[PDB]
Every structure is written in C-alpha cells, then in structure tokens.
Ligand binder design. Structure first.
Ligand code: HEM
Ligand SMILES: CCOc1cccc(C(=O)O)c1
Ligand SMILES: [Cl-]
Length: 393
C-alpha cells in the first residue's frame, strides 16, 4: 500500500534540480519507500512536522543520517545533542541554549553588524564579486570563529570539516566516501580546538567549558559540545546567507521592497531559509511499530524527512515557489521543530539580519553576471559560485 519509488535524493541529478522529484515524492503519497537506500520517506509538511514532534517514536540516538548506530559504528563519536534523545539530550541542550542565549546576542550584535556593513562597503568597492566566497563565506568567517574564541591558525579546516559532517549524514555514495577519505587532518584540528586551553575567554567555547560546574554537564562533555558549534555553526550560515543573496538576485522586486523597509531584513532571511532550505534532509529511526499516514512502519526503520519539500508543500504554503519577504514564515521546518529545533538559530538570524540590513541600505541592484555553479552535498543545498555585480545605492 506504500508506493515504492526509485528516486535517489542523494544523486547529483537530484541536487541539480530537486523540485520536480520533490512534488513526485509529495503526490505519490504521505509515506513512500525509497528502494535505492531501503528507507521510508516523508515529503509533505504534515508528516514531516509530525515526525519531528514525535521524538520518542522517531528517535535520534540511532543516528540522524542513513547509518544506523545500532548496526554500524559512527564515523565519529556521536554528538551529545543532535544524536541524543531525552532525557540524555535535555541538559546538553540547555547549556548550548544558555551559551547562545538572548543575553549573549546583545554582546555580539554590534560587532556582527559592523562587520556586515564593512563587508558590503568593501564589496561595493570591487563591483563584480563572488557572492559565495566574497560574501556568503567571507562574512561568517569574519565573525563566527572569533565569536567562538578560536585562534587564527588552522581556520581553513573549518569549512572542509563542516562539509565532511553534512556529507556523512548521507548514504555511502562517492560524496560521503570521498569526504571521510580526506578527513583525518580536519578532525584533528577541530578536536584540538575543543579543549579548554585553546578557546579564548568570553567566546562561546570558553562559555561552554564554564558551564561544567553547574551540574548540567561535566568537564568531559564540554569538548563535544564545542564540537557541535564547530560542526554546525559556520557552514549552515554560509548556505543560509548564500541563499538569501541568491533569492534577492533572482527576485529584484523583493530586493526593492527590502530597500524601502530595511526592518524586513530579518523576515527576508527567514523566508530565504524556507525558500532554499540549506539543511535539506535529516533521518530518524523508529523505536517501535508506528502508523504514519495510513502506513505501518516496523521497528528500527530509517525515515527520511524532506525538510526542503515540506517548506514548499502547497498543502501548507500558498505560492510555495515564490520568494516573499513579507510572508508569515512561522511554522517552516528550515530550523527543525520540537526538542531538536536549531539551538543556534539566534546566531543564524543575527548574522542573516545584519547582512541583509547592510545590503538593504547600501545596495541598489544585484545582477548575476557570470556562470552559476552549484555545490553538491548530501545534506546542504547551496552554490559553489555566484558571480554578481553590486550597484551602489
Ligand atoms: C541557516 C542557518 C541554520 C539552519 C538552516 C539550521 C538548521 C537546523 C536544523 C533543521 C536542525 C534540526 C536537526 C534535527 O532536528 O535533527 C538544527 C539543529 C541544530 N543546530 Fe542549526 N541551523 C542553522 C544554524 C545553526 C547555528 C548558527 C548553530 C550554532 C552556532 C547551529 C547548531 C545546531 C545544533 C547544535 C543543533 C542540534 C540541536 C538539537 O539536537 O537539539 N545551527 N539546525
Ligand atoms: C543542522 C545542525 O545540526 C548539526 C549538524 C552537524 C553537526 C551537529 C552536531 O551536533 O555536532 C549538529
Ligand atoms: Cl571529529
């Protein structure tokens, strides 16, 4: 009764244009079976939202990738928060919440916004730039590693390590095999910076290590919690900011509405997160036999959630293929939903807002003037190169 589909959502053809296949996944039924990897799939908004908010049945401690930790060894020690279930997930999550707290954003917002204005001012002096390397990558690299309290040496390992982690969530294809095949130097750097003496005072890293005496985490848990921020804190904001610029480059009408009201910068970034969904997919594992969308799913089965497809489901969104900076984006699953919803979404929204704010006040037009190249990742959707000409306001 469950439709079987041969679509490979982790193929280069799928990444190149996933929207026709995503509607096919949605319309085939509420629950599908992907014969390519022997997993269940949910593509409509309702089932994606239901699975995310049922952590007891659709657990994360057996891996949020394709690999089942009950069957295969994890390529790295499991994350204490992303790949953990309640109650073991509760207190590590609370520490990262207080480290990336609303009170923390007040201390870094001015420096984050000043670096965004300075970056746009610098890019306008060049004219024709690469919105990926010179903006989507250059800006987060100019604020986040310093906010983490990282030293200067070795920062070129951060993005390769992140692309490795998100490629590792995928199936054992060549993208995943090649990533782990080039991995030992990157984890050696990242794991070393997770140690307390290597994190500058005042940064997120030192703040995590200071939370070890409250009884919420132990000193031996702090390095892996810092590893979470070094795994997910940079590459997500790169593809999130690269998505917003790509949207404003393809939709000049929305760029003109943003210029007229720069206070829309926060929602313009949030709508970009829904439109592109830089975090495309995540898995869950059934801890029991469960009925979902008229389909019964056995225990220990992998269920693939299409977050990007749920953000474009016409059963939930009106004109889902339209970029609307004034759309009420509340409910989108670009940051997840439930107990695992993005704990660093305040940092991500701060970086996105101040960057779109700088563009809104300083840029009059963003025109693509070069060949667009896509970056292929088993989890992340984003561009490799985006040549644009920036016209000063
Ligand atoms: C555009 C930017 C971002 C997007 C689209 C995004 C997306 C997501 C999503 C979809 C989840 C849910 C994962 C799941 O339910 O299995 C998540 C969780 C998480 N994110 Fe973000 N994220 C972003 C930025 C960040 C930043 C800036 C940080 C840290 C500084 C971060 C750290 C984390 C962590 C640690 C988790 C695990 C939370 C948990 O398991 O309770 N992310 N993110
Ligand atoms: C989508 C953000 O979620 C992530 C991604 C990669 C690593 C981790 C972690 O907890 O180390 C979390
Ligand atoms: Cl590692």
């Amino acid at each position: 009764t469950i439709p079987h589909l041969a679509i490979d959502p982790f193929s280069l053809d799928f990444f190149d244009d996933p929207y026709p296949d995503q509607q096919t996944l949605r319309d085939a039924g509420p629950v599908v079976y992907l014969d390519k990897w022997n997993v269940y799939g949910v593509a409509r908004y309702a089932e994606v939202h239901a699975v995310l908010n049922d952590p007891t049945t659709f657990c994360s401690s057996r891996g949020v990738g394709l690999s089942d930790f009950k069957k295969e060894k994890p390529w790295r020690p499991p994350s204490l928060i992303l790949e953990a279930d309640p109650p073991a997930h509760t207190r590590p999550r609370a520490v990262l919440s207080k480290v990336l707290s609303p009170a923390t954003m007040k201390t870094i917002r001015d420096g984050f916004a000043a670096a965004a204005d300075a970056k746009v001012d610098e890019l306008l002096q060049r004219g024709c730039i690469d919105a990926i390397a010179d903006l989507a990558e250059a800006y987060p690299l100019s604020v986040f590693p310093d906010a983490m309290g990282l030293k200067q040496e070795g920062r070129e390992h951060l993005l390769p390590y992140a692309g490795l982690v998100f490629n590792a969530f995928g199936p054992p294809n060549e993208l995943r095999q090649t990533a782990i095949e080039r991995s030992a130097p990157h984890q050696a750097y990242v794991n070393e910076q997770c140690q307390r003496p290597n994190l500058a005072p005042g940064g997120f890293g030192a703040c995590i290590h200071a939370f070890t005496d409250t009884g919420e985490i132990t000193p031996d848990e702090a390095p892996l919690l810092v590893r979470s921020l070094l795994s997910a804190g940079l590459d997500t904001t790169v593809n999130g900011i690269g998505a917003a610029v790509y949207c404003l480059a393809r939709f000049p009408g929305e760029l003109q509405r943003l210029r007229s009201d720069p206070t829309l910068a926060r929602n313009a970034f949030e709508e970009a997160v829904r439109f592109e969904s830089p975090v495309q997919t995540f898995f869950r594992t059934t801890t029991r036999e469960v009925e979902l969308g008229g389909a019964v799913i056995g225990e220990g089965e992998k269920v693939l959630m299409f977050l990007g497809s749920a953000n474009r489901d016409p059963r939930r969104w009106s004109d889902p293929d339209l970029y609307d900076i004034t759309r009420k984006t509340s409910g989108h699953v670009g940051f997840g939903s439930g107990v695992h919803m993005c704990v660093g979404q305040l940092v991500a929204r701060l970086e996105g807002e101040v960057m779109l704010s700088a563009l809104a006040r300083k840029v009059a037009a963003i025109d693509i003037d070069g060949p667009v190249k896509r970056r292929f990742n088993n989890t992340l959707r984003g561009l490799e190169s985006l040549p644009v000409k920036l016209t000063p306001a």
